[PDB]
Paper text:
KPC-2 (Klebsiella pneumoniae carbapenemase-2) is a globally disseminated serine-β-lactamase (SBL) responsible for extensive β-lactam antibiotic resistance in Gram-negative pathogens. Carbapenems, the most potent β-lactams, evade the activity of many SBLs by forming long-lived inhibitory acyl-enzymes; however, carbapenemases such as KPC-2 efficiently deacylate carbapenem acyl-enzymes. In KPC-2 and other class A SBLs, the active site (containing the nucleophilic Ser70) is bordered by the flexible Ω-loop where the general base for deacylation (Glu166) resides.
To investigate the interactions of members of these different antibiotic classes with the KPC-2 active site, we utilized the isosteric Glu166Gln substitution (KPC-2E166Q)13 to slow the deacylation of the acyl-enzyme (allowing resolution of the acyl-enzyme intermediate). Pre-formed KPC-2E166Q crystals were soaked with solutions of ampicillin, cefalothin, imipenem, meropenem, or ertapenem, representing three different β-lactam antibiotic classes (penicillins, cephalosporins, and carbapenems) for a range of exposure times, and diffraction data were collected. The resulting data extended to a high resolution (1.25–1.4 Å) with a clear Fo – Fc difference density in the KPC-2 active sites, enabling confident modeling of the antibiotic-derived complexes in which the cleaved antibiotic is covalently bonded to Ser70. The penicillin C-6 2-amino-2-phenylacetamido substituent was modeled as a single conformation in which all atoms could be resolved. For all the structures presented here, KPC-2 could be modeled as a continuous chain (residues 25–293) with the respective Ω-loops (containing Gln166) all present in single conformations. However, analysis of the B-factors of the Ω-loop (residues 165 to 170) in structures of KPC-2E166Q acyl-enzyme complexes other than ceftazidime (for which a weak electron density precluded modeling of the Ω-loop, that is, with ampicillin, cefalothin, cefotaxime, imipenem, meropenem, ertapenem, and faropenem) shows a negative correlation with steady-state kcat values, indicating that faster antibiotic turnover rates are related to a lower average mobility of the Ω-loop. In the case of carbapenems, therefore, efficient deacylation can in part be attributed to the relatively well-defined conformations of the Ω-loop in the relevant acyl-enzyme complexes, although comparison with substrates of other classes (e.g., ampicillin and cephalothin) for which the turnover is faster and Ω-loop B-factors are lower indicates that these are not completely optimal.
Numbering used by the authors: 25 to 57, 59 to 252, 254 to 294
Amino acid sequence: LTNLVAEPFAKLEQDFGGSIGVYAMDTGSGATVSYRAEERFPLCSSFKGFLAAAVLARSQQQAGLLDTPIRYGKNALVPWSPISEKYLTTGMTVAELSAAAVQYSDNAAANLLLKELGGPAGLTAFMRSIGDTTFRLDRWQLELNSAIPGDARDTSSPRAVTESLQKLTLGSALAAPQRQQFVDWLKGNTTGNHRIRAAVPADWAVGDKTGTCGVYGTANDYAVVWPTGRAPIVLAVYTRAPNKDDKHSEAVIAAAARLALEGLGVNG
Ligand SMILES: *C(=O)[C@@H](NC(=O)[C@H](N)c1ccccc1)[C@@H]1N[C@@H](C(=O)O)C(C)(C)S1
């Protein structure tokens, strides 16, 4: 049921000047679209969705975790921290940091939450615990964005991202209240309007998390999509390019998502 219908991903990545990795899953029939799906690509900020899921998992065992206030000093503010910078003088709750990391890709909030989980190895351990043997986080923001060609640190594959996203949003990896909260955070994301969402009709529900490393044409998005009248679709789109100063493209991510949906026979 893989690639029942061929799509021109090769021409798309050639026009972009890099590599594109795609894995899309129709959760009803099990049919898939797959292109470079088992290659490693840098996560960039897309790790933060899984970080929020790991926080929610912990909260099943710590009833008070989400409401815990976290205070932080100016030395915790990283470039691109649009929410946490407004609460420096007050603090934010764990739930609010999680929402900011997912929905604004707030870099300081993500580092604070990583600390709570025991750092990159603690997030990697959570992904191992849901059966993902590919994902690895090695460093913190912003060093994890280096996107060096051939470097396996801070990478996963489009396929493993999609498989883990499915387990967390639709499967049994989180208890039902935490599952819906993860979904609601993804649905409220603000940074993805020009990526997978641009290929999804306005009358369908969707949640996503983006990543943009800033170098090596490296950027990405993953999403769960609920077309009306059929089962949901889970997909991941990752890009990279050979030269440090190659620019990323939002349009190429949207175009790859359109091809994935066409390949699954989802009318959009
Ligand atoms: C994670 O990927 C973060 N990326 C960065 O901080 C980069 N230094 C950067 C690249 C391009 C423009 C500004 C910063 C954050 N997540 C990105 C995303 O979710 O697409 C981001 C651009 C919102 S910042």
